[PDB]
């Protein structure tokens, strides 16, 4: 029924900023997870509620692939129960997450001589993101009680911040591409299954 288009997700030329993280729905296709897990291409490949070696034996109603770019020392925030600027304000996994977090160093593709500042993360927000919530607004953040009126100033901040990805950065401040696979099984016929 056609192979699932994982390459469309994992080898995309352009990845999203985490604040505007990208979601692709995967449905009606044969998924080979082992070829991802056993590729030796990833520095993180961990699953919650499923084993990585058993993914090829599982059927799901739908799969969601969320993808974005963060720095390496923030990869640890892409896990249930984690807190920090990324989990709080950018991309939040639920406590009962079933799926996989997959990450790899993308310095060879996302670093520029002179610095790559294209990737942004939300630095300020009034409250924490709910699980799988996406906030792409770009309003001036009111830190105090006086309204901002579209204007920076005292207690009034632009809420997005560039990562400063210089190629000479330490590995903790290097860019990592991240894909979060979410597996849903509902009481519908399974559309995404493993091979054989």
């Amino acid at each position: 029924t056609n192979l699932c288009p994982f390459g469309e997700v994992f080898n995309a030329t352009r990845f999203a900023s985490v604040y505007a993280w990208n979601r692709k729905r995967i449905s009606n296709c044969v998924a080979d997870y082992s070829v991802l897990y056993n590729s030796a291409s990833f520095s993180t490949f961990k699953c919650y509620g499923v084993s990585p070696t058993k993914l090829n034996d599982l059927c799901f109603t739908n799969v969601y692939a969320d993808s974005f770019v963060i720095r390496g020392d923030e990869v640890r925030q892409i896990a249930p129960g984690q807190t920090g600027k990324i989990a709080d304000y950018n991309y939040k996994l639920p406590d009962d997450f079933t799926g996989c977090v997959i990450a790899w160093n993308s310095n060879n593709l996302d670093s520029k001589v002179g610095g790559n500042y294209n990737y942004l993360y939300r630095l300020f927000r009034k409250s924490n993101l709910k699980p799988f919530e996406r906030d792409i607004s770009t309003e001036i953040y009111q830190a105090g009680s006086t309204p901002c009126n579209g204007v920076e100033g005292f207690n009034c901040y632009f809420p997005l911040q560039s990562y400063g990805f210089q190629p000479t950065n330490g590995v903790g401040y290097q860019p990592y591409r991240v894909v979060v696979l979410s597996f849903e099984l509902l009481h519908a016929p399974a559309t995404v299954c493993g091979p054989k």
Partner: nanobody, 121 residues
Framework: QVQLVESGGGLVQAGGSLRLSCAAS????????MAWYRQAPGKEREWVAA????????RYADSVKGRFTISRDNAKNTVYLQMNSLKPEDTAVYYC??????????????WGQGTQVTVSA
């Protein structure tokens, strides 16, 4: 490594125009946010204008709305502030500004040396 150099400015009569430049070295001008501030004699440094890579591209303080326009040139790694219909209240030292994040999540404010802008009544 990160450095901002303001140029432009000088003396102008009320109603005249000026273009300030901010040459950036160590980082690309295409980034989250680049800002212009100004500090008048005896006053607090205040935000004037900013250009953003996401959302509304430009924002301006109320007192300069409709009279200033900010822009960027990537080939020259520069940000410009075009100032029209200048008024004596616009007299100040002008600074460009960026806010960077470091390895240990420090937030550093980078300023240039400033350029003097004088508008005579």
């Amino acid at each position: 490594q990160v450095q901002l150099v303001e140029s432009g400015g000088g003396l102008v009569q009320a109603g005249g125009s000026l273009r300030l430049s901010c040459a950036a070295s160590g980082f690309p001008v295409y980034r989250d946010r680049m800002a212009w501030y100004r500090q008048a004699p005896g006053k607090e440094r205040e935000w004037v204008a900013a250009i953003y890579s996401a959302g509304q591209q430009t924002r301006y303080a109320d007192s300069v709305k409709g009279r200033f326009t900010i822009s960027r040139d990537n080939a020259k790694n520069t940000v410009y502030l075009q100032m029209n219909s200048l008024k004596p209240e616009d007299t100040a030292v002008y600074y460009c500004n960026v806010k960077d994040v470091g390895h240990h999540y420090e937030y550093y404010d980078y300023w240039g040396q400033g350029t003097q802008v004088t508008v005579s009544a």
